[PDB]
PDB file of C-alpha atoms in Angstrom:
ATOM      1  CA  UNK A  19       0.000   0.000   0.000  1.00 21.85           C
ATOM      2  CA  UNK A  20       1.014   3.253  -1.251  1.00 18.96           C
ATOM      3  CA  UNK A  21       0.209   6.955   0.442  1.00 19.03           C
ATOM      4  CA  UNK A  22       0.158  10.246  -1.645  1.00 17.03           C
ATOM      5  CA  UNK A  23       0.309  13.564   0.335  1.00 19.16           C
ATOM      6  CA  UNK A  24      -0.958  16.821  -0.628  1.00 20.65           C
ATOM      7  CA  UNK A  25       0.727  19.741   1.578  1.00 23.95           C
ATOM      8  CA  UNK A  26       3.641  22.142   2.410  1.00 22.17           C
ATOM      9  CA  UNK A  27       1.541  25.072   3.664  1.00 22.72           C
ATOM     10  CA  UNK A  28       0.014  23.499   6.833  1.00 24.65           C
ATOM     11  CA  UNK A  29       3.380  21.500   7.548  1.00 26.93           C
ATOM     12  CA  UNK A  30       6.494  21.558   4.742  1.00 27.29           C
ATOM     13  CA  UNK A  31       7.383  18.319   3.307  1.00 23.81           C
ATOM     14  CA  UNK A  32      10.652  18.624   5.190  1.00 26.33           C
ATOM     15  CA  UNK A  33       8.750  17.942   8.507  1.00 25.68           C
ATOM     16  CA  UNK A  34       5.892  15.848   7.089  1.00 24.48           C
ATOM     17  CA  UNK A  35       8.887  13.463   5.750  1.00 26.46           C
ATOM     18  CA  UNK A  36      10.405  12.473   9.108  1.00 27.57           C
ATOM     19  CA  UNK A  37       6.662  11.422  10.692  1.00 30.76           C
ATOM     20  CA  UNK A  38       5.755   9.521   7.370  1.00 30.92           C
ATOM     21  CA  UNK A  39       7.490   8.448   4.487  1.00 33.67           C
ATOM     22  CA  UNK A  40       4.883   8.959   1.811  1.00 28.34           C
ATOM     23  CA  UNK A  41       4.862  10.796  -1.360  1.00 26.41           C
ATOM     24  CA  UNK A  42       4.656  14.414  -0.844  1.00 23.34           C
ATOM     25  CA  UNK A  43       3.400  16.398  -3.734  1.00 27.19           C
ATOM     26  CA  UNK A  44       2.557  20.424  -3.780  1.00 28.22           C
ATOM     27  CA  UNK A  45      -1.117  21.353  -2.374  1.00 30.59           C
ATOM     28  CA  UNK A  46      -3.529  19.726  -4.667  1.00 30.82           C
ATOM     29  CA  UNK A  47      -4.804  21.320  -8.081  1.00 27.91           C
ATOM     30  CA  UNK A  48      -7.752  19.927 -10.297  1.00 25.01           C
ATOM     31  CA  UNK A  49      -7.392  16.746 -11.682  1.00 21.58           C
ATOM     32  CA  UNK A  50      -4.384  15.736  -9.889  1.00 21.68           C
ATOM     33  CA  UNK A  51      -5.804  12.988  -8.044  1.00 23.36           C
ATOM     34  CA  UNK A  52      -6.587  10.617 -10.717  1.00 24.63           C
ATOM     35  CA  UNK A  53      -3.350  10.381 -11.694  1.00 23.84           C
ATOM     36  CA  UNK A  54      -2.305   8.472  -8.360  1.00 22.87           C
ATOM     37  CA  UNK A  55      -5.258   6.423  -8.265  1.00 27.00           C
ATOM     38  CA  UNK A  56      -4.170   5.209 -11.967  1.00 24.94           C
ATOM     39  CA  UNK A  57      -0.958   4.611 -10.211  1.00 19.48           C
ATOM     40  CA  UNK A  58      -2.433   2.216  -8.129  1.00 25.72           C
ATOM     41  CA  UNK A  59      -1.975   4.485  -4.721  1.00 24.74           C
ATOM     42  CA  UNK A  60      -4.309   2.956  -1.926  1.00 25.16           C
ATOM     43  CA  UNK A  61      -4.511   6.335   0.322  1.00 28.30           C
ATOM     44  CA  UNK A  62      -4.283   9.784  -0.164  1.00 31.11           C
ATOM     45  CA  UNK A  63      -4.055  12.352   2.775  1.00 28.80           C
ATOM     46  CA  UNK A  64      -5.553  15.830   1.089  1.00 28.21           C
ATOM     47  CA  UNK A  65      -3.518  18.358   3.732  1.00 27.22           C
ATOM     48  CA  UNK A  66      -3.055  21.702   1.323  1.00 26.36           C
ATOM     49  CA  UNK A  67      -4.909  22.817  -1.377  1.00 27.79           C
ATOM     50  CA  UNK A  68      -5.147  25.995  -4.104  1.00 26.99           C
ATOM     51  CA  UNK A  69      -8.969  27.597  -3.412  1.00 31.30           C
ATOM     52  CA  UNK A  70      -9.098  29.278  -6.765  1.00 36.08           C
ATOM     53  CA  UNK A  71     -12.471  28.080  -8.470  1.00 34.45           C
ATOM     54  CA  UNK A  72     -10.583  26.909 -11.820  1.00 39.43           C
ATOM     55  CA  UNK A  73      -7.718  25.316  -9.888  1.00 41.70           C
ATOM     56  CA  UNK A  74      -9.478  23.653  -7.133  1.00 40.41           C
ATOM     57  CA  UNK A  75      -9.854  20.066  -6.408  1.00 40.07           C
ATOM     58  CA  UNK A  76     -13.268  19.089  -7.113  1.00 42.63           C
ATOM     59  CA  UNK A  77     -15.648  17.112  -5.670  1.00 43.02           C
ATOM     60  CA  UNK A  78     -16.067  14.469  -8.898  1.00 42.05           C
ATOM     61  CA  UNK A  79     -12.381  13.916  -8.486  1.00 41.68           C
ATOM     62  CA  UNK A  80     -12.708  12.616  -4.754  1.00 37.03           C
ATOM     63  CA  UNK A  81     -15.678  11.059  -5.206  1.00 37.51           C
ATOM     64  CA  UNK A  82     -13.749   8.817  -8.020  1.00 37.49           C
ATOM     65  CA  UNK A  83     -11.000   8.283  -5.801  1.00 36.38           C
ATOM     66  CA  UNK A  84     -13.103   6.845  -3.661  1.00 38.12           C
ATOM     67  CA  UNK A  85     -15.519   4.644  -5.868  1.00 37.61           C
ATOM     68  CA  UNK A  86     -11.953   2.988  -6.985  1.00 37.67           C
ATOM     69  CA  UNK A  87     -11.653   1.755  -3.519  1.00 36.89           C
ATOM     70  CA  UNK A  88      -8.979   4.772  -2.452  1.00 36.32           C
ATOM     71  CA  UNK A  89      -9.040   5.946   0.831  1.00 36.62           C
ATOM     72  CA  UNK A  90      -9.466   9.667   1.432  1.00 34.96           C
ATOM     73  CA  UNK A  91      -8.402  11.759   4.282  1.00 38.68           C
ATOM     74  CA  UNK A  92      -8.781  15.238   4.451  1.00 38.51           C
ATOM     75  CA  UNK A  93      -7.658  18.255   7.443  1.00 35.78           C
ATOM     76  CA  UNK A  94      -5.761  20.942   8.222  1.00 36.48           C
ATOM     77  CA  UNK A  95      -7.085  23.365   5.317  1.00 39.27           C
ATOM     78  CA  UNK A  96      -8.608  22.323   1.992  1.00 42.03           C
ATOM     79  CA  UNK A  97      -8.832  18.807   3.126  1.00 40.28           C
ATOM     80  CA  UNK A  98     -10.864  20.077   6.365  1.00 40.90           C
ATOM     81  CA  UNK A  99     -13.557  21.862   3.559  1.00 40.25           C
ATOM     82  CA  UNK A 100     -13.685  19.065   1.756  1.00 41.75           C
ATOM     83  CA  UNK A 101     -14.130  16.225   4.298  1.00 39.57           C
ATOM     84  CA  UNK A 102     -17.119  18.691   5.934  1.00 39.75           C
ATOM     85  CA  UNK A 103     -18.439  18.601   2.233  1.00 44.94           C
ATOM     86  CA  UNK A 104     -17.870  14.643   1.667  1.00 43.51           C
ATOM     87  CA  UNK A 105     -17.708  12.795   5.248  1.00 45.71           C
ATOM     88  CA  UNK A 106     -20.954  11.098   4.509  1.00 43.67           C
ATOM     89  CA  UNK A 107     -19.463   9.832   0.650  1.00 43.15           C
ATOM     90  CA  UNK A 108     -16.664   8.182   2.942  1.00 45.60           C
ATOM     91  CA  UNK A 109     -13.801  10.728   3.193  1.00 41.69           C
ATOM     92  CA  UNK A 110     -12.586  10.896   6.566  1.00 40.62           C
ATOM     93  CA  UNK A 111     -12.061  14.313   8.246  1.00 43.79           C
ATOM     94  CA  UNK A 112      -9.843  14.466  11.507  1.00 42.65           C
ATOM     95  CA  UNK A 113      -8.335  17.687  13.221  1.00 42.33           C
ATOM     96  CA  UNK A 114     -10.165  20.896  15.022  1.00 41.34           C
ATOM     97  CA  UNK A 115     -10.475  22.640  11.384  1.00 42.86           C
ATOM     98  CA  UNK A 116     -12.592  19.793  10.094  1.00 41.17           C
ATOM     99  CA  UNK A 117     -14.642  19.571  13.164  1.00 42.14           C
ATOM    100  CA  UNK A 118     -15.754  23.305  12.876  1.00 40.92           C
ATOM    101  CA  UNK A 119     -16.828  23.570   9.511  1.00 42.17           C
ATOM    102  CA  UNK A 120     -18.664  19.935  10.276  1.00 41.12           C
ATOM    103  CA  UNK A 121     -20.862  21.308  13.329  1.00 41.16           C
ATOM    104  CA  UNK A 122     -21.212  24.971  11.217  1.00 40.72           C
ATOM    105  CA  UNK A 123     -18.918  26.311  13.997  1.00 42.06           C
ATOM    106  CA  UNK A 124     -16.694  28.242  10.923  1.00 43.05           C
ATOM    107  CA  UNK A 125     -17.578  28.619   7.153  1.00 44.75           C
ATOM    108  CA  UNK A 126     -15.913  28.954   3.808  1.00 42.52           C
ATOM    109  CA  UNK A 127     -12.436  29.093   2.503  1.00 38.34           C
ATOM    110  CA  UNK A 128     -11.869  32.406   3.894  1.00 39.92           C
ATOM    111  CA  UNK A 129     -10.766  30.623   6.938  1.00 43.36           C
ATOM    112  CA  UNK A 130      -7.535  28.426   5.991  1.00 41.57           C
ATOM    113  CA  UNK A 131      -6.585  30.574   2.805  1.00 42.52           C
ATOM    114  CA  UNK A 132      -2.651  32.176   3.098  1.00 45.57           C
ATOM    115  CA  UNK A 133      -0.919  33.631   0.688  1.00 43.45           C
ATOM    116  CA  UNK A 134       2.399  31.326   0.003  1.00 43.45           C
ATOM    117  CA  UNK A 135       5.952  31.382  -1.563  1.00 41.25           C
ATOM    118  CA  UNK A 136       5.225  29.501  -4.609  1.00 40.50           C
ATOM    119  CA  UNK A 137       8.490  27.922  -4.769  1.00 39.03           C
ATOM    120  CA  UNK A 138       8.825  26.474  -1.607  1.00 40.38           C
ATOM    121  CA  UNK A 139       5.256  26.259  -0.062  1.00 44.11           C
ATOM    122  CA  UNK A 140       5.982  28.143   2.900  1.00 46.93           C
ATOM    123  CA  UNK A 141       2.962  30.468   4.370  1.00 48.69           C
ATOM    124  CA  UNK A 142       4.053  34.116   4.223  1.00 44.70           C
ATOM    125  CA  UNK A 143       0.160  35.101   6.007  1.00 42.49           C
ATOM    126  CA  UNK A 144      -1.288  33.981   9.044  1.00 44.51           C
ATOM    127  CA  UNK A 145      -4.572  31.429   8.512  1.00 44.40           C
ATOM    128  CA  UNK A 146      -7.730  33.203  10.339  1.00 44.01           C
ATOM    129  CA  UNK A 147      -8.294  29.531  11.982  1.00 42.74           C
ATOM    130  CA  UNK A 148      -4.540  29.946  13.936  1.00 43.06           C
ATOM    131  CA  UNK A 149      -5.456  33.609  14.539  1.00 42.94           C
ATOM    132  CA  UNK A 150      -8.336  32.959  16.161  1.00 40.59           C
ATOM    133  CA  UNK A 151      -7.145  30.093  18.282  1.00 44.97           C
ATOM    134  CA  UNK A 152      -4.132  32.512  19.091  1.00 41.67           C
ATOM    135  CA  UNK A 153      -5.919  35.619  20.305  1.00 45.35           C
ATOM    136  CA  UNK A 154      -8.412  32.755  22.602  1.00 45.32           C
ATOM    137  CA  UNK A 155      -4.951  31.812  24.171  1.00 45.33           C
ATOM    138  CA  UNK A 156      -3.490  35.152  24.336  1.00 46.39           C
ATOM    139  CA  UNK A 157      -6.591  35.941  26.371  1.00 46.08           C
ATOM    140  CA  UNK A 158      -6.294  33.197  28.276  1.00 48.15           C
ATOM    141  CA  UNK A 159      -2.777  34.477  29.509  1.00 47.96           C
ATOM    142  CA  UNK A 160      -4.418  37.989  30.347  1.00 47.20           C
ATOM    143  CA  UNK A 161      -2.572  40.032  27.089  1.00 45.80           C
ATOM    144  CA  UNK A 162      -5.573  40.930  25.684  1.00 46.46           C
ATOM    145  CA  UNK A 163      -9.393  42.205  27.442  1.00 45.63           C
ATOM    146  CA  UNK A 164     -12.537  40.481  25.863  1.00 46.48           C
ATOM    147  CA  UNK A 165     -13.148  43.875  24.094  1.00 44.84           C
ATOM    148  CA  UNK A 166      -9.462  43.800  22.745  1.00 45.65           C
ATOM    149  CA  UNK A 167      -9.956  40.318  21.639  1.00 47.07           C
ATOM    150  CA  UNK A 168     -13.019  40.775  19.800  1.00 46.39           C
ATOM    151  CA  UNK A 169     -12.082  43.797  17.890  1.00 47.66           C
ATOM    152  CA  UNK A 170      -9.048  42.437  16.676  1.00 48.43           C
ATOM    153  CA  UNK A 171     -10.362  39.588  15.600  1.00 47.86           C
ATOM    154  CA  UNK A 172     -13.325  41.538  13.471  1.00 46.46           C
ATOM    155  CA  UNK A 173     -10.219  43.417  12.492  1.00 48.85           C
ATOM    156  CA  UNK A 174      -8.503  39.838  11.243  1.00 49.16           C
ATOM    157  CA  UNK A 175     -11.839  38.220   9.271  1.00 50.88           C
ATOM    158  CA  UNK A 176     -12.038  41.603   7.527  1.00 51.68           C
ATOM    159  CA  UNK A 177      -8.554  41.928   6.286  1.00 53.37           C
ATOM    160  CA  UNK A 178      -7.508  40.178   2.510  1.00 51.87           C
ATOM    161  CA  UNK A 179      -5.887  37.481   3.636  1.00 51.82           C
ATOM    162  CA  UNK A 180      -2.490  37.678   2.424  1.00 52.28           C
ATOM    163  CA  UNK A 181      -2.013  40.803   4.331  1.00 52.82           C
ATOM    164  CA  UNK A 182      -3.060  38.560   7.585  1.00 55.42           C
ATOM    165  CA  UNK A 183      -0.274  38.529   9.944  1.00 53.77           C
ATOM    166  CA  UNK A 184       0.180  39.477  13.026  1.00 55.59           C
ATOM    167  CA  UNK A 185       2.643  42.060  13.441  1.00 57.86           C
ATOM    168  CA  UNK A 186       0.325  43.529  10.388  1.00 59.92           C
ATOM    169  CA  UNK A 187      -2.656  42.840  13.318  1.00 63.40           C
ATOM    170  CA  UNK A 188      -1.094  44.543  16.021  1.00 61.80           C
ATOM    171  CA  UNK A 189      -0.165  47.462  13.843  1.00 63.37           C
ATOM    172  CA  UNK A 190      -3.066  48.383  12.248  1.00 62.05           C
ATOM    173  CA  UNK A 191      -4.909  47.666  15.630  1.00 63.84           C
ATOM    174  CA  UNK A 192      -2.764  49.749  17.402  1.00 61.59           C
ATOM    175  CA  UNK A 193      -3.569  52.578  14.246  1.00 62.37           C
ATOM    176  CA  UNK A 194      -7.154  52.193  14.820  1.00 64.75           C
ATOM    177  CA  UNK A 195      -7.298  52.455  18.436  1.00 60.80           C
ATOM    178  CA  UNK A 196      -8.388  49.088  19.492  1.00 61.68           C
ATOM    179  CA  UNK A 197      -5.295  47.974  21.694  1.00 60.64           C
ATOM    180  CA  UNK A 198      -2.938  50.262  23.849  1.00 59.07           C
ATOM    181  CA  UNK A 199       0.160  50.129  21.913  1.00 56.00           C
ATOM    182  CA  UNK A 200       2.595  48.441  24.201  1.00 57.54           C
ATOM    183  CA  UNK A 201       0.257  46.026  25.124  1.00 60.62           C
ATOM    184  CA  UNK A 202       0.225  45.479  21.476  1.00 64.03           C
ATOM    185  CA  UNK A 203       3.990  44.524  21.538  1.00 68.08           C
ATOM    186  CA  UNK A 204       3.524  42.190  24.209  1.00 68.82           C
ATOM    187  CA  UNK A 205       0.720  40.702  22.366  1.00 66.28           C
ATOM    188  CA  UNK A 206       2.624  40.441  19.474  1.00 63.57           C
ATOM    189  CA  UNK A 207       5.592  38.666  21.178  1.00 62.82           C
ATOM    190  CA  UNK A 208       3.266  35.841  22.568  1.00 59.73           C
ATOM    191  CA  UNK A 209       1.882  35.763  18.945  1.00 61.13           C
ATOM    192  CA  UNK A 210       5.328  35.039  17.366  1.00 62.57           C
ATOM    193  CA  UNK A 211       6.873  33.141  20.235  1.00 61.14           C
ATOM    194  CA  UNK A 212       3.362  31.011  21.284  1.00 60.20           C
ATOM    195  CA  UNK A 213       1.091  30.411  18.296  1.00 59.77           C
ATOM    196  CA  UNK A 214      -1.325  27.808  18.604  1.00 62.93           C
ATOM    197  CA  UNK A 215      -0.703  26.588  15.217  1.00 65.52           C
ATOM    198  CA  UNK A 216      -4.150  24.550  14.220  1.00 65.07           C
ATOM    199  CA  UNK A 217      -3.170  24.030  10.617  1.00 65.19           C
ATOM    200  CA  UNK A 218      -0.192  22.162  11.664  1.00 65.86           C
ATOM    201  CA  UNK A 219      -1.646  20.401  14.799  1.00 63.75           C
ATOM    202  CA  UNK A 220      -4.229  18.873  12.520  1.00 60.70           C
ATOM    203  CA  UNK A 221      -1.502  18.481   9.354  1.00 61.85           C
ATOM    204  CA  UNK A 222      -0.047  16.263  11.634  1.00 63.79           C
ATOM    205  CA  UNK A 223      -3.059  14.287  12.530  1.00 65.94           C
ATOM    206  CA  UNK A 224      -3.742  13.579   8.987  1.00 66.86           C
ATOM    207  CA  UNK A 225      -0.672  11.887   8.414  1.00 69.49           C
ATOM    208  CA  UNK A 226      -1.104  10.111  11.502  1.00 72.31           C
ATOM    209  CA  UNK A 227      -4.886   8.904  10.142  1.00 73.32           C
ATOM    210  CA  UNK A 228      -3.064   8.144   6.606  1.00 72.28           C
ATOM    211  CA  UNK A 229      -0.065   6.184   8.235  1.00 73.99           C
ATOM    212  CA  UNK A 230      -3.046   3.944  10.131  1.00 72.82           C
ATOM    213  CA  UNK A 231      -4.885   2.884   7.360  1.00 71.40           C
ATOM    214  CA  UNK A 232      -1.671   2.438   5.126  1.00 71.28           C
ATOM    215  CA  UNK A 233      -1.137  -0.413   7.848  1.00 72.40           C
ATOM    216  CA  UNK A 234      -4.630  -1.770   7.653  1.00 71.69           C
ATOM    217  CA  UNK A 235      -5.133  -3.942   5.195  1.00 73.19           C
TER     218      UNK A 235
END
């Protein structure tokens, strides 16, 4: 049995590789699947994906997958809108991301898109899902008042997303009079030193849900 990954945003291929060997490919495009099926590929893991209407994995192309007798996981980002989309077809969705879109908690793309180096993969803006699990924490530790929270995080969902970040959040909240400026540094130092990284917490739980049913037979 064979597993085919598609990431590199949520978690690189670098540290995807050392957790399970698989096949990494770049976050998944339209019609990209069928090729590995044809390959003979028993599982793929759908981490990463581009959101672009023309580009985007569709919903036919799963659903194949899946009639051939391929296994389907999906988290983390487009495979977390996907597997809230197809869970009862038989793709399996696992992680926090999946869960909220599945109980209506969150809704649409808007959520996991970032902008990314398109050489390399790597995120350059922050997902809303990690910003919003990041300002609950940073709350939690007392940086921010519920008022402070809130407003920055209306602030975050109505920002274009590859100008997400948050030393760009801090700023512009700082700008705008919604957070005391040096409590905006120390808010921003938790941000970059403390993230609670979603994307990658549940990347990592898809390969761990891939790597179990590659053993199953």
């Amino acid at each position: 049995a064979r597993a085919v990954i598609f990431t590199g945003n949520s978690i690189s291929h670098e540290d995807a590789k050392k957790i399970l060997r698989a096949n990494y490919q770049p976050p998944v495009r339209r019609f990209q699947l069928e090729k590995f099926v044809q390959q003979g590929y028993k599982v793929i893991g759908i981490i990463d994906g581009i959101f672009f209407d023309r580009a985007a994995v569709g919903h036919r192309e799963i659903l194949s997958a899946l009639n051939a007798g391929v296994k389907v996981v999906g988290g983390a980002s487009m495979g977390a809108l996907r597997a809230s989309e197809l869970d009862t077809h038989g793709m399996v969705g696992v992680g926090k991301v999946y869960e909220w879109y599945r109980d209506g908690v969150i809704e649409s793309d808007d959520e996991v898109a970032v902008s990314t180096n398109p050489d390399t993969f790597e995120p350059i803006s922050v997902p809303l899902v990690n910003i919003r699990e990041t300002l609950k924490a940073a709350l939690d530790t007392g940086l921010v008042s519920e008022k402070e929270h809130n407003a920055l995080l209306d602030l975050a969902i109505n920002t274009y997303y590859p100008d997400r970040s948050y030393l760009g959040l801090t700023k512009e909240g700082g700008k705008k009079g919604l957070i005391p400026k040096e409590k905006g540094k120390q808010l921003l130092d938790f941000c970059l030193n403390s993230e609670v990284d979603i994307k990658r917490q549940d990347a990592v739980l898809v390969l761990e849900t891939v790597k179990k049913l590659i053993e199953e037979a």
